[PDB]
Amino acid sequence: PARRPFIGGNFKCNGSLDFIKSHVAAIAAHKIPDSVDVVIAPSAVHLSTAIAANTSKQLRIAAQNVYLEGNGAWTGETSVEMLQDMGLKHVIVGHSERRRIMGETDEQSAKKAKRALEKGMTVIFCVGETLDERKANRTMEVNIAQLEALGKELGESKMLWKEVVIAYEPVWSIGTGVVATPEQAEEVHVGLRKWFAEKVAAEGAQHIRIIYGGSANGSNDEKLGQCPNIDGFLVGGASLKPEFMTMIDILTKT
Amino acid sequence: PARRPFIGGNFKCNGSLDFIKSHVAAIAAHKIPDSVDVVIAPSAVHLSTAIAANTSKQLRIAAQNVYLEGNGAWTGETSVEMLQDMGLKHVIVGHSERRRIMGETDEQSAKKAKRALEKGMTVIFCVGETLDERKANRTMEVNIAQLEALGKELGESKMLWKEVVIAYEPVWSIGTGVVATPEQAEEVHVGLRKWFAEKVAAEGAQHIRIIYGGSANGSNDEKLGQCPNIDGFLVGGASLKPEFMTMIDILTKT
């Protein structure tokens, strides 16, 4: 049973018009196969610019964040319809930064993802646990509660999980001084697909994509691809460098 | 003690690319004097596009929000550096929608204005109280507090107030169509300028631009402008309508 390899690029709060132009062009030129999905998430101010630079059939732009309200009195916010009007398919939801740093609740992350999913978008729905929580031993407790909020919000319409790519962020290895082992990452991915099968759809638990946003590198990734329940990567800082193309290359070979 | 009149328009989380082009060009095609400061805030997604539609030499584009950190791991967050790279001089800060709905603290809003102010942006700082607060009679107290948090962050560099525009938006007034009588609108501006001379500076107070926000509209706008301490308007709903251009004519004539 094969799921489709999927790699995301998260630029976060990085870039200028020129860097978008030069970087997007860089990735676009890299030969991208059709067995693989490649997405990059530029900052909102750069969506229009990145999209002009994308001369690629294969690659597509995503957005880092969106709101749980349609167009309205929501200053400082983007809506799904603004995204779709610009021709965007993918958006990132639940990133650790917005959850952990910016006070974004599981409900807001789940409410946000559902809304987008209703309208046909693919959501990179991001979940992960911090070191305190790993140490508590609630690795599963924390991730599943993040996931369960999505199950609850999607609810009856479980068709929507189809457009969800799970992103596991090993937040506890982000300069905690602790790095992840491919074993530890895989163990989590197995544990999550187990939840989805057991509590959503056993049939569709083999079709969902779960990617490892966990300090994946040019190396230590050829290993990570090998992990069977790891379906690809959500790169962060490295998505701003040419290392990113190489990471793409690995996914294909693996 | 003459203040240069300032009218700002907030699209809020509204717009389509096509809409943005057409409207921005309808505004640019309007005769704007060198006497009045005009600024419009489209969504971050539409910033590039709005700047391209803008053929005016007086009109400026603004941002409805900015983050309090710089470039880096703030997924879903825009930075002043991104803004200035795009050629933006104005950003909106401390809007009741984000304050009263999304949980932006007073200091969160204060640290955003300061950082954007340090890098020489002209900040549209928003203050305002809820229907309750006004009834509890806590108007000046609330407006002062939101205003104080900026003082605290600014601290020694008090001149960063020079490029501050203050928008008092009654919380009750906004959207509910119910609005502030000129007697009322003016009442608040005196207290706020009272605060500024009192707490900040007595020469700079003469020059700080306090603009009135909320349900501003034709006919009504007219007396509102005549109020000698109301230096302009922050428009939401009508900024989207051809009405906005009319509003600028009134502001100047006044």
Author numbering:
A (entry chain O), B (entry chain P): 2 to 255
Authors' description from the paper:
TIM is a ubiquitous glycolytic enzyme whose active site and overall α8/β8 barrel domain structure are highly conserved; even so, structural differences in its interface region have been used to achieve specific inhibition of enzymes in parasites. Since Giardia lacks oxidative phosphorylation and depends on glycolysis as its major ATP source, it has been proposed that disrupting this pathway could hinder the survival of the parasite; therefore, glycolytic enzymes have been considered potential pharmacological targets. Our results indicated that derivatization of C222, a non-interfacial residue located near the surface of the protein and 10-15 Å away from the active site, specifically inactivates the enzyme. C222 is at the end of loop 7, with its lateral chain positioned in a hydrophobic pocket formed mainly by carbon atoms of residues N218, G219, E223, F234, M248, and I251.
C222N and C222D respectively exhibited a catalytic efficiency 10-fold and 17-fold lower than that of WT GlTIM, indicating that electrostatic factors in the region of C222 are central in the expression of catalytic activity of GlTIM. The most severe changes in the Ki values were when negatively and positively charged residues were introduced; for the C222D mutant, an 83-fold increase in the Ki was observed. On the other hand, the C222DC mutant produced triclinic crystals with a P1 symmetry that contains 10 dimers per asymmetric unit. WTC and C222NC produced high-resolution structures (1.6Å and 1.45Å, respectively), whereas C222DC was solved at a resolution of 2.7Å. The C222DC structure had an empty active site, which is consistent with the binding data that indicate the low affinity of C222D for 2-PG. The crystal structure of C222DC provided a clear atomic description of the structural changes induced by modification of C222 that explain the observed detrimental effects on GlTIM. In this structure, it is relevant that the 20 monomers of the asymmetric unit display structural variations in two specific and localized regions of the protein. The structural alignment of all monomers showed that loop 6 (residues 175 to 182) and loop 7 (residues 214 to 221) exhibit a clear heterogeneity of conformational states, which is evidenced in the per residue α-carbon RMSD values of all chains. In regard to loop 7 it is important to highlight that even though slight conformational changes in this loop had been previously noted in response to ligand binding, the relatively large conformational differences of loop 7 in the C222DC structure has not been previously observed; its main chain atoms move as far as 2.7 Å from their original position. Therefore, it is reasonable to assume that the introduction of a negatively charged side chain in the low dielectric environment of this hydrophobic pocket is a thermodynamically unfavorable process that destabilizes the entire loop 7, and alters the structure of the critical YGGS motif.
